[PDB]
Write a protein that binds this ligand. Structure first.
Ligand SMILES: [Mg+2]
Lengths: 320, 228, 186, 228, 228
DNA sequence: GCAGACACTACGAGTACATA
DNA sequence: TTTTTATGTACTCGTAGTGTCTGC
């Protein structure tokens, strides 16, 4: 085959984690920028950041190492404290390589806040040790990496693909999903389903595979499972529909339903009405909901105070 | 009941396994790590004349260090613990045997799979070095029909590759290939010579340290490999 | 400095190779360089009616709210977000302001008060001494300055200027100049 | 090759000077501080048979202080350092000289410009007092025809105007005027007696301490004020 | 004035009562606690030849250890302190007395309201056990005709009802019922034998410990109940 | 016996959060 | 052409100062 299987594990988005730098689904320029690196043979100081989880960051790190036959220390970013940097990180850099192997240090998920000192400390560690080894950093939020590090490092941002890189990258993944179904023994009756999984989750390939796991429950991806993946989210639809229609009997009825977590429901409402209503009705929905929110918890009957929000909205909110 | 510097000794040890302990009437004490990584058991001199749950085992072992050897430990009329020293009396709590993690029964080992031994002297040389050498993971395998231990540093080589340390334990008589990997964190046992019985069935397996005084049984780790 | 051929090693190599972590410390500390706060990119987005670039970022409802408070034309919609702000999505709060504050422009300077921190001292030292609050402490300064010249009150009270109290009044060596000033012209 | 208590004890001291050392074949061992400010030299019974740089110096000796004296220290089959104990073995990482710094050549000492000595108890007092008085710098000069040392705290003392501590060594028989300033960081020498030897030419100079087991040369800072 | 092994023993103890001290010319010294809860006088074998205040009494006792026994303190060139070694000299800052807490009069204890005794051995057991059991309060009273000491955790006890520890001391030949209460952080006295003199007049009461080296007087807490 | 070395404590700085 | 409200609470990091356990 062309695919890697780890076979030591059952969790399937991790059974199939790519081995080389080729196996990866990356945008054009980035993938090349990576081959080019494994060509010149020695690895520069790199920071890899998503922030969407599961875009390949920590995979592309492990790969660069495989492709350079590097001697690697994989470390938990949250475990890398000042004494680690002084300690087994310096122990490592300074101790000798007769293999003629690029020494690479992978610091995975380095974006924590209290590591500010470990970070300032590394940025210096780099100047003294730079020629023994090299450092690949994985982060979700770059801002959690001190600016003096983003400086000395090549910073490659995953997750923001061009419009064409979106189109190809998904093709590559539809193909990849099908291949995993070949091995795991899943049958594909309707393919529109494998395309659904990929479009639906796109920036994140990890959930994208996971959702392949949970929807294979029966062992076939069929036209019915299509209906589930595709099917249209939020259950605030009943209230949104009643508000458009400006009726009460229905709204009056839904109030006691969401009386349970009011704090959550008010959020999901502000979220989904903001898109579905006119611009100057937007300025009002905040006044209406923002006030209703303030006085909640003063309000005696929560169910009723929720009804009073529904009526207030149906009148003033307008839209198509 | 009365506790002897010998047994107060074997307990400070079971404190490095579970912060608490369950001891029921008898000559026999067991404990197990809360996360099930380590199980200890022993038979003792001093005789245990009532049941009780001890939440703090290491701090009460700290408070029994302040009385005379003659001190008389009794359940308190009020159900806690009374330590009567000669000129003095101390009062220490009991928790219910629900909040201390007891094993059910004294887990019997299976028929072993391979067996070697280790001398007291050579246990010292391992523990004591691990600190310096940063050996946090070790492996019992065969080399030249003679079983060796191997120290590694798992953070430096995640792959257990550059072996920083080794100690040859005795001749290997049977014929099987194995790498058993033990986390230095589970090695909690006190020093001295142990008969070593290890067992493996596929994704099953365990290592029993059979001491003179107490027995120790330690979990292997998951990258452990073997055919048995 | 012996040996006279040492390929001068950088600040860092010396530190690390020799292993004195306090050298390592001055070295690391060298990169301290702390500012950030792209807050005005969000604020200016709300004034100049541009593309959001948010919820990906860290929003201060207070920064924004307050920055906009600089301009009387915004107040109606800053105020609105006051009474109603608590319990609005950090995002909702941004969507409102965008749909609210109409024109756009702002130049920087925020309003702060004048502190004669001579005078701030004298007031906090009356407030402490008599366990009365600030507004009364005021009346105090006036009837002392007016009558009794309050050098005496300043004289008796100087005893406790405790340097920690100073940590409350101003933030810098201007504080150590007061330490001396109240200890002086009574 | 094997190591002697004598040659081990000597070494740890050399560790305080540099976290490592570069040694080669001989009975002669040496380190220099990386910063260039301090250097040492010593000759011992035991005989060095292969060139090796170490890395954790204080560490190598730690392992040593565990195994027997019968410990034989070879070059590891992989270019590391292999150490052979009774029933066992240990590989210490072979360091990478890219990092390590030691003396290129043992540059020797110009004849003493002025000569004194310092008693065992007296070195001790200095050191242990520097702690409680926070002295980071000292000065050797002459007051009242005798050669003395002066402890100052450079952080509160710009100009070293205020003397917290002074050590009288016995009289000066020369006629020259000097004020010589060393950093307390760079005084690594071990206890026991030291003959002192001070050399200067106008913008450059040093001090050598000559003891029963070693020699040390620490460099003077800028604010040394001198003639000739 | 020079100071002996036996003299700095005390003072090292007095620093636990009050950070600094003010000693006056004579054979006698006292620190009193700042909060005024506890107080210590004693008489020594050395003579103080001038008045001085020491703000860091610990710090100073530390630098003393590092000088010879023969060492001579005396008022230094300016208002401040000087310790003259045979070979060297050390300066310590002389505190302005505004800065150190002085007792103000050698409190001449009343006639004992009850006398008992506590051994080097018992006091030892108390102080330590106090730690393990978080015992911050003790109350001395009569139990079955003997003078007992009791102790609790006034935090989780609050009523001083549940008794964590009981100590038998000696018996009580008088006929009166008293319960005397001391705050434990007020018990700071060097180990060994003390004659305990309890004294109470109504709402004022105290406890004097008469040691073979120094004397100690601790405040009784408000809760003390008695008939005297 | 001390001094040295290890382990555990605590405070200061940083960070982030929610209600007013 | 900018730039930090008040009151309480919680988690983590780092270091320095305290202890006890150990080795000539
Ligand atoms: Mg990751």
């Amino acid at each position: 085959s062309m695919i890697t299987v780890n076979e030591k594990e059952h969790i399937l988005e991790q059974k199939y984690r790519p081995s080389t730098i080729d196996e990866c689904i990356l945008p054009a320029f980035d993938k090349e920028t990576f081959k080019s690196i494994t060509s010149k043979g020695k690895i520069p100081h790199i920071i890899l950041h998503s922030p969407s989880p599961g875009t390949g960051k920590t995979t592309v790190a492990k790969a660069l190492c495989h492709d350079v036959n590097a001697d690697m220390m994989f470390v938990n970013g949250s475990d890398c404290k000042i004494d680690f940097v002084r300690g087994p990180l310096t122990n490592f850099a300074s101790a000798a390589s007769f293999d003629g192997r690029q020494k690479v240090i992978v610091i995975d998920e380095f974006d924590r806040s209290g590591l500010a000192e470990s970070q300032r400390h590394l940025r210096s560690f780099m100047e003294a040790y730079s020629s023994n080894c090299s450092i690949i950093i994985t982060a979700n939020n770059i801002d959690g990496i001190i600016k003096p590090l983003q400086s000395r490092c090549r910073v490659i941002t995953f997750g923001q693909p061009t419009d064409e890189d979106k189109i190809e990258m998904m093709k590559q993944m539809i193909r990849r999903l099908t291949e995993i179904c070949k091995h795991e023994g899943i049958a594909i009756a309707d393919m529109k389903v494998v395309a659904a999984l990929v479009k639906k989750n796109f920036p994140d390939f990890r959930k994208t595979i996971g959702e392949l796991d949970s929807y294979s429950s029966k062992g076939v991806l069929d036209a019915g499972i299509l209906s589930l993946v595709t099917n249209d989210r939020g259950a605030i639809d009943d209230v949104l529909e009643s508000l458009k229609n400006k009726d009460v009997k229905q709204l009056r009825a839904l109030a006691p339903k969401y009386a349970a977590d009011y704090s959550w429901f008010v959020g999901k409402l502000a979220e989904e009405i903001y898109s579905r209503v006119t611009p100057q009705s937007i300025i009002r929905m905040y006044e209406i909901v923002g006030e209703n929110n303030q006085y909640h918890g003063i309000a005696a009957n929560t169910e009723l105070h929720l009804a009073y929000l529904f009526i207030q909205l149906a009148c003033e909110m307008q839209w198509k | 009941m009365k506790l002897s510097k010998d047994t107060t000794a074997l307990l400070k040890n079971f404190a490095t396994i579970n912060s608490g302990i369950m001891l029921k009437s008898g000559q026999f004490i067991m404990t197990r790590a809360v996360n099930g990584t380590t199980y200890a058991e022993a038979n003792i001199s001093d005789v245990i004349d009532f049941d009780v749950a001890i939440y703090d085992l290491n701090g009460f072992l700290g408070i029994l260090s302040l009385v005379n050897d003659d001190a008389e430990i009794s359940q308190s009329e009020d159900g806690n613990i009374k330590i009567a020293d000669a000129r003095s009396t101390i009062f220490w709590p009991a928790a219910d045997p629900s909040t201390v993690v007891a094993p059910n029964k004294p887990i019997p080992f299976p028929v072993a799979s391979a067996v070697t031994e280790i001398k007291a002297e050579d246990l010292q040389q391992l523990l004591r070095v691990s600190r310096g050498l940063q050996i946090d993971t070790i492996a019992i395998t065969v080399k030249e029909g003679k079983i060796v231990i191997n120290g590694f540093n798992k953070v430096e080589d995640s792959a257990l590759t550059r072996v920083k340390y080794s100690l040859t334990l005795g001749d290997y008589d049977g014929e099987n290939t194995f790498n058993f990997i033990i986390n230095m964190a589970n090695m909690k046992m006190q020093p001295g010579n142990y008969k070593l019985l290890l067992w493996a069935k596929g994704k099953q397996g365990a290592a029993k340290f059979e001491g003179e005084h107490a027995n120790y049984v330690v979990a292997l780790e998951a990258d452990s490999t073997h055919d048995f | 400095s012996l040996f006279k051929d040492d390929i001068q090693l950088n600040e860092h190599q010396v530190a690390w190779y020799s292993k004195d972590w306090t050298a390592v410390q001055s070295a690391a500390d060298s990169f301290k360089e702390k500012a950030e706060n792209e807050f005005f990119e969000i604020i200016g987005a709300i004034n100049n009616k541009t593309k959001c670039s948010i919820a990906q970022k860290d929003y201060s409802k207070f920064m924004v709210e307050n920055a906009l408070s600089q301009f009387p034309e915004c107040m109606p919609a800053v105020y609105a977000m006051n009474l109603i702000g608590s319990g609005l999505s950090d995002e909702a709060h941004f969507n409102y302001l965008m749909a609210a504050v109409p024109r756009g422009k702002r130049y920087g300077k925020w309003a702060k008060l004048v502190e004669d921190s001579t005078e701030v001292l004298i007031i906090k030292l009356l407030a402490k001494r008599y366990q009365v609050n600030t507004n009364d402490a005021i009346n105090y300064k006036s009837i002392l300055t007016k009558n009794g010249k309050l050098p005496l009150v300043l004289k008796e009270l100087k005893g406790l200027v405790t340097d920690d109290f100073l940590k409350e009044v101003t933030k810098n060596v201007k504080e150590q100049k007061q330490l001396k000033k109240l200890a002086l012209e009574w």
